[PDB]
Design a protein around this ligand. Structure first.
Ligand SMILES: CCNC(=O)N(CCCN(C)C)[P@](=O)(Cc1ccc(NC(=O)C(F)(F)F)cc1)O[C@H](c1ccc([N+](=O)[O-])cc1)[C@@H](CO)NC(=O)C(Cl)Cl
Lengths: 219, 222
């Protein structure tokens, strides 16, 4: 099939800024009839995609002139001359020239804001969960920016990823930050076998990891 | 009145079948090609099928021999009959009008429906276990508390704090599928001067199982 590659995956912008999203196809998008069916869609949260530009440069009805499309053959570009609040969402290019029509992976237009270190909280397993034979240690990493963060769990100085569930929130419409939850689930047996549980976060805001630890012996 | 409305989505076990419908209004349905497009949980968009105004049919290779598209031009309804469903067929299915008629030099998706959710899973409805998350009390101006909503199915679950009276400083994380069951967590941050003094409770609702749990977050040593 024709692979549509979009770059970047996430694009941080400030309102008023100009923005460009690239879409490249693995093969020519020119159809046998001579036309290029390269379209661009914008999808906002909880909404269906909406057409913005069709056949490379034609703006669809009701789309503001701030949106422009260009390119040829295998390289296309979506340009937003001035980003408004209502432009935030995921942009997708699409080629409908060859069967099967394919979509690019999407480009998230996000709000750029100052770097913020995560506020990390760690929670020991509740007494109620232990009763059912389970043990989940929870780590919340809240209000940080940018979204790129690596969290590692260490049990008595040794890394463990098995049994870990990670989830990220979308950008907060209030402070434009991101938040993350990381849950390490072990059997009650395993949990009472170790003493130190560490949630370790690597974020560009610090040269050393942000560490929050819970030592059972200190309870 | 140009609108597309999909229906028929829901839960089905792998190998099962389901029929989606897409009702069209506001335009002469018969003069346009129509298409079904799906969006995976990972948000990847994938074209499934296109049926032209003249009836020419084009399928994504992976659904060929499993899906059957059809249209009723009298009732302005587009159907998608899915059979031999796989886990990877789990997605939000959108019908879309294609601005094309047989022989036209233009074609593009100009109108989309709201979508209908399809979930292919062997899992059965399972109420959640709700656990309070409180800091070790022996361990700042603000305190973060939370609730862990573990091992439920299917989506969704709703989480509020103090029956909604506590809306600021709350983060509810998207559910993550683990071993066929979903787990979700929620955190709430409040001034240290209010907790434990004031009570904080998380309310969890899971409609699928009529579950409504209120879990008070009480201080405790670990
Ligand atoms: C074997 C028969 N040959 C063909 O089929 N084609 C010629 C292939 C030539 N190469 C092998 C060199 P093809 O290009 C294949 C094709 C099909 C769908 C789409 N896109 C979408 O479906 C959407 F998702 F992008 F919209 C893109 C290409 O058909 C075109 C087409 C476009 C749109 C629709 N529609 O919307 O339903 C139907 C058909 C067009 C000829 O052009 N046909 C017609 O108008 C006939 Cl008279 Cl109906």
């Amino acid at each position: 099939d024709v692979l549509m590659t979009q770059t970047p995956l996430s694009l941080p912008v400030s309102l008023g800024d100009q923005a460009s999203i690239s879409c490249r196809s693995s093969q020519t998008i020119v159809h046998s009839n001579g036309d290029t069916y390269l379209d661009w869609f914008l999808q906002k949260p909880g909404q269906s995609p909406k057409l913005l530009i069709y056949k490379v440069s034609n703006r669809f009805s009701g789309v503001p002139d701030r949106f422009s499309g260009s390119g040829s053959g295998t390289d296309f570009t979506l340009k937003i001359s001035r980003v408004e609040a209502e432009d935030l969402g995921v942009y997708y290019c699409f080629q409908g020239s060859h069967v099967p029509p394919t979509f690019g992976g999407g480009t998230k237009l996000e709000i750029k804001r100052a770097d913020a270190a995560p506020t990390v909280s760690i929670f020991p397993p509740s007494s109620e969960q232990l009763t059912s034979g389970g043990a989940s240690v929870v780590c919340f990493l809240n209000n940080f920016y940018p979204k790129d963060i690596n969290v590692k769990w260490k049990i008595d100085g040794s890394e463990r990823q098995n049994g870990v569930l990670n989830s990220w929130t979308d950008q907060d419409s209030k402070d434009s930050t991101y938040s993350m939850s990381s849950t390490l689930t072990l059997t009650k047996d395993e949990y009472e076998r170790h003493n130190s549980y560490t949630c370790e976060a690597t974020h560009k805001t610090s040269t050393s990891p942000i560490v929050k630890s819970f030592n059972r012996n200190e309870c | 009145e140009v609108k597309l409305v999909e229906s028929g989505g829901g839960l089905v076990k792998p190998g099962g079948s389901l029929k989606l419908s897409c009702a069209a209004s506001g335009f002469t349905f018969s003069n346009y090609a129509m298409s079904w497009v799906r969006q995976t949980p990972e948000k990847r968009l994938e074209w499934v099928v296109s049926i032209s105004s003249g009836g020419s049919i084009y399928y994504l290779d992976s659904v060929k021999g499993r899906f059957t598209v059809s249209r009723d031009n009298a009732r302005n309804i587009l159907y998608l009959q899915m059979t031999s469903l796989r886990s990877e067929d789990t997605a939000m299915y959108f019908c879309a009008r294609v601005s094309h008629y047989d022989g036209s030099r233009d074609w593009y998706f100009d109108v989309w429906g709201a979508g209908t959710s399809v979930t292919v899973s062997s899992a059965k409805t399972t109420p959640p276990s709700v656990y309070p998350l409180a800091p070790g009390s022996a361990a700042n101006s603000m305190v973060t508390l939370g609730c862990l909503v573990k091992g439920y199915f299917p989506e969704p679950v709703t989480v509020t704090w103090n029956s909604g009276s506590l809306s600021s400083g709350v983060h509810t994380f998207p559910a993550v599928l683990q071993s066929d069951l979903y787990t979700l967590s929620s955190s709430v941050t409040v001034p240290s001067s209010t907790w434990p003094s004031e009570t904080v409770t998380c309310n969890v609702a899971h409609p699928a199982s009529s579950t409504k749990v209120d879990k008070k977050i009480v201080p405790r040593d670990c």
